[PDB]
Write a protein that binds this ligand. Structure first.
Ligand SMILES: *C(=O)c1ccc(NC(=N)N)cc1
Length: 245
């Protein structure tokens, strides 16, 4: 997260921290995700495409810190890693950038809700907030494009939804953005998602309910003028989620 503020898991209790075990046993952070039901975390296919083996992955819920255990956290194996079979990636844009992880602890159990573990509601089909709406993004991604390290503490920021029209403009993304993507950015371009934030949630309040409107997907750099963050438009993927859960 470029700019924004530090947070703890209590403020985004659906947030999933996804890590990969490397050959040799070393564990590195991969991507965020969101808990949509006790047994299901939703993320981005781009996070997993180079290493598609479900056994390589570890999912935490209730975790506020990157490389320290948060009190109350729960740790899961991935029992099913479902990548979108129509996923495609150009030099920047990711298409159908959506993935489902069925989670199962060593004791053979799904998430158990708590102060630090809750589900996030899915949108109603094609039901998205109007452009200019303020939404929140959460992740362990870089605080600056030039950073080597990821923050140890979880971060959040606010970005505003941008219309398909505006995002299609020449100096923005042109035809790279489709109607299955949502753009969001800061008016001053001062806060954004960055490397490490992908797979994570874009949450909007829709008719009074906190809704997973988006999945952090792609962008040209981070917090660059006329280069919004691009999100998987979740309200356009309900059939795929339905048929795989
Ligand atoms: C994901 O890792 C990711 C998503 C989006 C960006 N860029 C912007 N939001 N501009 C970088 C990395």
């Amino acid at each position: 997260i470029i700019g924004g503020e530090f947070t703890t898991i209590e403020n985004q209790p659906w947030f999933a921290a996804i890590y990969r075990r490397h050959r040799g046993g070393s564990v590195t952070y991969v991507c965020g995700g969101s808990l949509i039901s006790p047994c299901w975390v939703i993320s981005a296919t781009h996070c997993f495409i180079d290493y598609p083996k479900k056994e390589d992955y570890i999912v935490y819920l209730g975790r506020s810190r990157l490389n320290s255990n948060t009190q109350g956290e729960m740790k899961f194996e991935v029992e099913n890693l479902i990548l979108h079979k129509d996923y495609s990636a150009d030099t920047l844009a990711h298409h159908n950038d959506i993935a489902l992880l069925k989670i199962r602890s060593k004791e053979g159990r799904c998430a158990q809700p708590s102060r630090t573990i809750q589900t996030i509601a899915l949108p109603s089909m094609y039901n998205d907030p109007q452009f200019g709406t303020s939404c929140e993004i959460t992740g362990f991604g870089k605080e600056q494009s030039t950073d080597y390290l990821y923050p140890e503490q979880l971060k959040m920021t606010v970005v505003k939804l941008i219309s398909h029209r505006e995002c299609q403009q020449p100096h923005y993304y042109g035809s790279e953005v489709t109607t299955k993507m949502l753009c969001a950015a800061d008016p001053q371009w001062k806060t954004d998602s960055c490397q490490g934030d992908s797979g994570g949630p874009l949450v909007c309040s829709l008719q009074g309910r906190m809704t997973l409107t988006g999945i952090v997907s792609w962008g040209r750099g981070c917090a660059l003028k006329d280069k919004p963050g691009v999100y998987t438009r979740v309200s356009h993927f309900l059939p795929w989620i339905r048929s795989h859960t």
